[PDB]
Design a binder for this molecule. Structure first.
Ligand SMILES: *[C@@H]1O[C@H](CO)[C@@H](O[C@@H]2O[C@H](CO)[C@@H](O[C@@H]3O[C@H](CO)[C@@H](O)[C@H](O[C@H]4O[C@H](CO)[C@@H](O)[C@H](O)[C@@H]4O)[C@@H]3O)[C@H](O)[C@H]2NC(C)=O)[C@H](O)[C@H]1NC(C)=O
Ligand SMILES: *[C@@H]1O[C@H](CO)[C@@H](O[C@@H]2O[C@H](CO)[C@@H](O[C@@H]3O[C@H](CO)[C@@H](O)[C@H](O[C@H]4O[C@H](CO)[C@@H](O)[C@H](O)[C@@H]4O)[C@@H]3O)[C@H](O)[C@H]2NC(C)=O)[C@H](O)[C@H]1NC(C)=O
Ligand SMILES: *[C@@H]1O[C@H](CO)[C@@H](O[C@@H]2O[C@H](CO)[C@@H](O[C@@H]3O[C@H](CO)[C@@H](O)[C@H](O)[C@@H]3O)[C@H](O)[C@H]2NC(C)=O)[C@H](O)[C@H]1NC(C)=O
Ligand SMILES: *[C@@H]1O[C@H](CO)[C@@H](O[C@@H]2O[C@H](CO)[C@@H](O[C@@H]3O[C@H](CO)[C@@H](O)[C@H](O)[C@@H]3O)[C@H](O)[C@H]2NC(C)=O)[C@H](O)[C@H]1NC(C)=O
Ligand SMILES: *[C@@H]1O[C@H](CO)[C@@H](O[C@@H]2O[C@H](CO)[C@@H](O[C@@H]3O[C@H](CO)[C@@H](O)[C@H](O)[C@@H]3O)[C@H](O)[C@H]2NC(C)=O)[C@H](O)[C@H]1NC(C)=O
Ligand SMILES: *[C@@H]1O[C@H](CO)[C@@H](O[C@@H]2O[C@H](CO)[C@@H](O)[C@H](O)[C@H]2NC(C)=O)[C@H](O)[C@H]1NC(C)=O
Ligand SMILES: *[C@@H]1O[C@H](CO)[C@@H](O[C@@H]2O[C@H](CO)[C@@H](O)[C@H](O)[C@H]2NC(C)=O)[C@H](O)[C@H]1NC(C)=O
Ligand SMILES: *[C@@H]1O[C@H](CO)[C@@H](O[C@@H]2O[C@H](CO)[C@@H](O)[C@H](O)[C@H]2NC(C)=O)[C@H](O)[C@H]1NC(C)=O
Ligand SMILES: *[C@@H]1O[C@H](CO)[C@@H](O)[C@H](O)[C@H]1NC(C)=O
Ligand SMILES: *[C@@H]1O[C@H](CO)[C@@H](O)[C@H](O)[C@H]1NC(C)=O
Ligand SMILES: *[C@@H]1O[C@H](CO)[C@@H](O)[C@H](O)[C@H]1NC(C)=O
Ligand SMILES: *[C@@H]1O[C@H](CO)[C@@H](O)[C@H](O)[C@H]1NC(C)=O
Ligand SMILES: *[C@@H]1O[C@H](CO)[C@@H](O)[C@H](O)[C@H]1NC(C)=O
Ligand SMILES: *[C@@H]1O[C@H](CO)[C@@H](O)[C@H](O)[C@H]1NC(C)=O
Ligand SMILES: *[C@@H]1O[C@H](CO)[C@@H](O)[C@H](O)[C@H]1NC(C)=O
Ligand SMILES: *[C@@H]1O[C@H](CO)[C@@H](O)[C@H](O)[C@H]1NC(C)=O
Ligand SMILES: *[C@@H]1O[C@H](CO)[C@@H](O)[C@H](O)[C@H]1NC(C)=O
Ligand SMILES: *[C@@H]1O[C@H](CO)[C@@H](O)[C@H](O)[C@H]1NC(C)=O
Ligand SMILES: *[C@@H]1O[C@H](CO)[C@@H](O)[C@H](O)[C@H]1NC(C)=O
Ligand SMILES: *[C@@H]1O[C@H](CO)[C@@H](O)[C@H](O)[C@H]1NC(C)=O
Ligand SMILES: *[C@@H]1O[C@H](CO)[C@@H](O)[C@H](O)[C@H]1NC(C)=O
Ligand SMILES: *[C@@H]1O[C@H](CO)[C@@H](O)[C@H](O)[C@H]1NC(C)=O
Ligand SMILES: *[C@@H]1O[C@H](CO)[C@@H](O)[C@H](O)[C@H]1NC(C)=O
Lengths: 449, 126, 110, 126, 126
């Protein structure tokens, strides 16, 4: 006769979700720099990334229903506020600003407002007449010369990110607790959302930099020997096409002007770091990209993008339609200060059948409200000296638009304002499962009495 | 063989019985944003105790191997021993038995420990 | 319009009629996002049908519809005098394309 | 019987001896004001192991049933079996024995394990 | 003897073999600045369950005593019984043998429970 036998420790898991803790590296732990934004007390990473490969295994991965990006996104947001609460508050900052244009000649565009305003000094009785150099995107004229005020100083309480911390994305390993295991789908050609032949049980996710770049993803994992385009629903034109590049595209961004710090005291012992006089020549920010590589990179995408739409169709790249400045342009932070680059010269081509660099006009913006947390706006202090920062473009957040009149041609546009798409470009090959070691099976075994 | 955690997950059930020791030890793994690990490692200890309590309430009281007097009912996907222990894996096994696992626990803990321990208690009554 | 509708359907109360939304292979056959609106003459359109057959709460349940391959259809049960309005079909043909519309008449001339 | 948690509370000790299974499975239950659910399930994982440790340190190592070699001192309400196992219930039982249970816990582990389990070793090393 | 927790610390291993029931009972102990006690009582139970899991995955499944079939390798401080159980204490013992405990545990679990438990299963399968 057959008797049921209990087996403990069996290799059995089920798709589930849980609170994934972190794991940071100890090689850069000496670089606390007074609690860098992301990692302060993150547990030290495992010295050995012990990953186990599995055979005769299949798992129905789904990068668009993945519960890890939801946990990572709310983690980054909650971790962001806890880095701003101990910083300085700039509620007394926005008074009527007598902003005049900086010392320049004709053919400026603006973009540099020399604002002078009364500021409460340490002593409540005395006041201080101090000036600063704000950007056009930070001030708006309220309505003698013109008077301005901070743009987000209605609506929201502006808060200055205290500059002791930094913004450089440090790799984060989202690790699962005991009883949970993260499965790394090591397959090459896999747009997520399907079965995975090669599933690897890894300790946890690889080093993931919490970068905020929207379109033109930066500091991202390269594709698998071929540009990987991932969409929740190809037919759904709105679905953001996540184009994972296989070869890193160089990009050189530069804050060309030499600005100084002011640290204007508004407290007792609270200092609004303001932009002093810009020493040197007055230029505007830009981001360079090798035209030889970018042309070749986009072409490699069209060859892959033509697979999902007819045998041969006309793929067109046009600059963003409209919206907030963080979607129409390429919003990202490299050297602690945020600047937005319009990138109209990056999506310009039109593909039918088959030395220089592009310079992108960039606009700098200090009063920031990322994640659209209305009522909570951040002020980014200036950075002394020029800001040169070279990153690797490894992604593209494209959106499709078409009247679909017989589907003769197709136009692809950039976008991806939501920051979950920045995480799905790294959290697509991972998923967490809870181990179910309790198992029953029939066997001729039978205990005694 | 020691193929690491979940080493032989895809292997045959007969061969997957020789790797239960690596996954039995890894089931325990030895402010703000620190609440994640503190609420996770309190979930890990509470989860492992749930399986250990079940392993105790049943007639096992033992690690990685247990045999009970509950006869295998034909309604629970009646097959043969060779058709299961070598043609299937632990992954495929529960996927078809995920109907009675809650009630299989029932008759295996009620009719066994409330009976064979009471029968053992009255056997030593003399 | 990309959707082909009958011009107008007339009828009498208490009876039942059927209005069809005949389209291509990319609007009704390619997707299951067929929808129907109710626009009273001079008022704003109001939705009564929005899935192959799933409808919202504010709609006479009598109104039901389905999808037959490359042809859609909406049937009207329990015709009443309040239904004297036009009805437009809506499906996702890789975009938003509406139907030509059909003016409904009950207890009245065509 | 499956009469839920504490189903046979008022039942006599003889009848309530067969319902220990349901009262053992439910002893584990599988911001501000959200600390209530955290600090409670930390108290449950620790309270459950408070008994599981004593149940292991004693000469039982088993579940729901245990017999030992410590003779019952008559000072602890010397009565007959039927006077207790059929006349009394568990509530009235400990209420009259909750005087000396601290010394019964010590004798169950000191005089049993450090004597018999140690005698078990000399039975194997001889 | 009951000399309190760690009472027989400096005593010989032969005499400290009877106080094991003591140093086990005291292994579980029944806002701001109050996070300390919660984190500590979570760490305590996690460490205790880690040790208990290590003990269970061995051929012991019980406390205060254990035996197995793994032979004492002659490289691991080849001495005599009185030369270890009477010439040293547990402190000097683990100090001089704070080399091989990990591999000893690994062998104890692998070579025994992945072999002797399946051996019992196959000898009861007949
Ligand atoms: C805090 O300050 C910011 C910046 O001033 C403010 O956001 C702006 O608010 C104004 C309204 O106060 C918005 O103005 C509108 O913009 C649209 C698009 O350009 C225009 O079409 C609007 O023009 C008219 O449109 C209609 C014409 O019939 C009518 O509604 C009316 O006549 C309008 O005048 C109008 O100019 C502006 O787009 C935003 N955007 C910016 C620049 O941030 C924010 O609302 C303030 N928060 C408060 C008041 O709490
Ligand atoms: C992708 O990864 C790259 C990795 O290099 C990353 O670029 C670097 O980011 C850091 C941090 O923002 C940049 O560091 C600063 O850069 C400026 C200009 O080069 C320096 O002046 C800074 O040095 C100091 O001196 C300043 C003047 O006194 C101080 O204000 C400041 O506090 C410092 O003491 C500092 O090095 C760095 O330049 C870039 N680039 C490179 C090549 O390192 C990039 O941002 C990542 N991209 C994304 C989207 O995350
Ligand atoms: C924006 O406007 C402000 C205010 O006018 C400019 O700052 C001021 O610039 C003048 C020179 O044009 C400074 O004057 C000189 O200061 C030195 C200080 O040691 C003094 O020795 C000289 O005799 C002379 O007074 C002035 O101090 C400075 N700041 C203030 C508070 O007035 C600012 O330069 C303008 N922006 C740019 C980029 O030019
Ligand atoms: C996407 O590409 C188009 C390319 O046409 C960009 O359009 C151009 O944008 C500039 C800046 O807004 C316009 O310049 C201004 O136009 C007005 C009206 O003619 C003029 O008075 C100003 O002096 C200035 O020249 C320009 O006209 C407009 N179109 C043309 C003809 O180039 C568009 O801005 C790009 N979008 C993004 C998001 O980058
Ligand atoms: C994106 O979403 C669309 C809409 O749900 C998905 O469309 C569906 O695609 C499948 C094929 O992958 C179609 O299945 C086939 O349909 C024909 C006609 O009915 C039938 O004869 C075949 O046997 C088969 O069922 C399905 O019909 C179609 N949806 C609808 C409502 O027509 C599309 O697959 C999604 N794309 C991705 C990448 O997930
Ligand atoms: C700081 O406060 C003083 C208060 O008097 C402001 O001074 C007046 O400013 C207006 C506008 O420029 C002039 O018309 C008046 O003549 C000024 N009065 C005096 C007595 O100087 C001053 O402008 C404020 N500064 C800023 C930029 O906020
Ligand atoms: C991004 O930069 C491009 C640079 O070409 C801008 O487009 C041009 O803007 C100038 C502004 O005077 C116009 O004269 C040109 O006709 C525009 N088009 C071309 C083809 O050069 C574009 O507007 C910028 N986008 C922004 C600022 O959002
Ligand atoms: C930005 O400009 C300042 C000012 O020129 C540079 O710092 C020094 O400033 C003093 C006082 O004016 C000069 O005597 C030094 O020669 C300056 N040093 C240099 C190297 O310019 C500052 O270094 C500049 N920052 C950058 C990144 O160019
Ligand atoms: C001065 O300020 C106005 C208003 O912001 C702006 O239009 C103009 O370009 C600025 N510069 C010059 C040179 O007038
Ligand atoms: C790619 O992603 C789409 C998303 O809808 C999914 O339908 C498809 O099956 C995926 N393909 C693979 C290789 O899994
Ligand atoms: C960026 O600068 C480096 C160093 O000069 C150069 O090697 C690289 O090609 C540049 N990238 C671009 C986009 O021009
Ligand atoms: C872009 O580069 C690719 C690769 O060299 C080439 O095939 C393609 O024709 C180029 N496109 C244009 C417009 O020059
Ligand atoms: C974008 O393409 C147009 C031609 O279609 C060109 O005139 C324009 O200069 C390009 N963008 C940039 C920023 O060079
Ligand atoms: C591109 O630059 C980023 C900067 O953080 C770096 O992480 C990445 O590894 C670089 N690309 C490659 C392929 O090395
Ligand atoms: C796949 O099956 C083979 C059968 O011999 C087994 O050895 C292997 O371990 C299986 N895959 C895994 C890693 O479970
Ligand atoms: C076996 O299955 C039958 C039908 O579902 C059921 O009546 C019977 O109680 C089952 N026996 C066991 C051992 O559970
Ligand atoms: C068990 O099987 C029945 C059909 O016999 C089914 O209705 C029920 O949903 C199943 N329960 C599961 C799969 O948990
Ligand atoms: C209480 O006593 C009544 C009468 O003897 C009996 O029917 C009932 O089952 C008892 N309840 C319990 C909990 O023992
Ligand atoms: C039995 O009771 C007597 C009187 O209280 C006491 O002296 C003695 O120690 C007890 N024996 C045991 C086994 O506890
Ligand atoms: C313990 O026993 C003594 C003597 O019988 C009695 O006086 C005392 O009340 C008892 N304590 C209890 C029952 O808690
Ligand atoms: C020290 O040794 C004596 C015997 O020589 C023993 O009685 C005593 O308990 C030992 N101390 C400790 C702490 O064990
Ligand atoms: C005994 O020690 C030797 C090294 O001296 C080692 O090679 C061997 O495997 C060990 N044997 C056991 C039983 O661990
Ligand atoms: C084990 O012994 C070797 C040889 O003496 C030594 O090198 C090593 O450090 C020891 N490991 C310990 C004490 O953990």
């Amino acid at each position: 006769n057959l008797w049921v036998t209990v087996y403990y420790g069996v290799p059995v898991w089920k798709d589930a979700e849980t609170t994934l803790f972190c794991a940071s590296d100890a090689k850069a732990y000496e670089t606390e720099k007074h609690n860098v934004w992301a990692t302060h007390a993150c547990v030290p990473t495992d010295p050995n990334p012990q990953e186990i490969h599995l055979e005769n295994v299949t798992e129905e991965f789904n990068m668009w229903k993945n519960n890890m990006v939801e946990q990572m996104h709310t983690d980054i947001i909650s971790l962001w506020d806890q880095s701003l609460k101990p910083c300085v508050k700039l509620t007394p900052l926005c008074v009527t600003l007598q902003c005049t244009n900086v010392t320049n000649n004709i053919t400026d565009d603006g973009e540099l407002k020399n604002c002078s305003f009364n500021m409460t000094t340490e002593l409540r009785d005395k006041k201080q007449k101090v000036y600063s150099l704000f950007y056009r995107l930070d001030v708006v004229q309220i309505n003698s010369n013109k008077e301005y005020r901070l743009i987000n100083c209605n609506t929201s309480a502006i808060t200055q990110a205290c500059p002791k911390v930094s913004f450089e994305p440090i790799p984060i390993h989202y690790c699962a607790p005991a009883g949970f295991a993260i499965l790394k789908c090591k397959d090459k050609k896999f747009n997520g959302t399907g079965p995975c032949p090669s599933v690897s049980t890894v300790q946890c996710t690889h080093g993931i930099k919490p970068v905020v770049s929207t379109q033109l993803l930066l500091n991202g994992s390269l594709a698998e020997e071929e540009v990987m385009i991932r969409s929740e629903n190809i037919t759904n034109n709105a679905k953001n096409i996540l184009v994972q590049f296989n070869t890193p595209v160089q990009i050189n961004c530069t804050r060309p002007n030499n600005n100084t710090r002011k640290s204007i005291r508004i407290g007792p012992g609270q200092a609004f770091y303001a932009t002093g006089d810009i020493i040197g020549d007055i230029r505007q920010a830009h981001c360079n990209v090798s035209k030889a590589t970018w042309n070749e990179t986009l072409g490699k995408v069209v060859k892959q993008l033509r697979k999902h739409f007819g045998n041969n169709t006309i793929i067109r790249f046009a600059n963003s339609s409209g919206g907030d400045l963080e979607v129409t342009t390429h919003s990202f932070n490299c050297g602690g200060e945020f600047f937005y680059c319009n990138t109209s010269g990056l999506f310009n081509s039109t593909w039918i059948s088959n030395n220089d660099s592009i310079t992108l006009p960039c606009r700098i913006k200090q009063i920031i409200n990322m994640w659209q947390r209305i009522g909570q706006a951040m002020y980014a202090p200036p950075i002394q000296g020029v800001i040169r920062c070279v990153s690797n473009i490894t992604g593209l957040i494209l959106t499709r638009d078409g009247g679909s009149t017989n589907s003769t041609t197709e136009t692809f546009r950039p976008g991806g304002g939501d920051m979950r798409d920045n995480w799905r470009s790294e959290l697509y090959k991972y998923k967490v499962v809870k181990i179910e070691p309790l198992g029953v099976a029939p066997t001729r075994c039978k205990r005694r009495v | 063989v020691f193929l690491g955690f979940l080493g032989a997950a895809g292997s045959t059930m007969g061969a997957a019985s020789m790797t239960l020791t690596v996954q039995a030890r890894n089931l325990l793994s030895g402010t703000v944003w620190g609440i994640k690990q503190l609420q996770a490692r309190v979930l890990a200890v509470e989860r492992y105790l749930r399986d250990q309590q079940l392993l105790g309430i049943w007639g096992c009281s033992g690690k990685l191997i247990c045999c009970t007097n509950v006869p295998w009912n034909s309604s629970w996907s009646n097959r043969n021993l060779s058709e299961i222990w070598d043609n299937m894996t632990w992954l495929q096994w529960d996927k078809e038995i995920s109907n009675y696992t809650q009630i299989i626990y029932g008759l295996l803990e009620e009719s066994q420990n409330q009976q064979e321990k009471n029968e053992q208690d009255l056997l030593a009554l003399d | 319009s990309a959707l082909t509708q009958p011009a107008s359907v007339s009828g009498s109360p208490g009876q039942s009629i059927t209005i069809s939304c005949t389209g291509s292979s990319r609007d009704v056959g390619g997707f299951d996002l067929v929808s129907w609106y109710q626009q009273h003459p001079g008022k704003a359109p109001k939705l009564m049908i929005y899935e192959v057959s799933k409808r919202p709460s504010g709609v006479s349940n009598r109104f039901s519809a389905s999808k037959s391959g490359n042809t859609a259809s909406l049937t009207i049960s329990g015709l009443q005098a309040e239904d004297e309005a036009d009805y437009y079909c809506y499906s996702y043909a890789d975009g938003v394309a509406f139907g030509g519309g059909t003016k409904l008449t009950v207890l009245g001339q065509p």
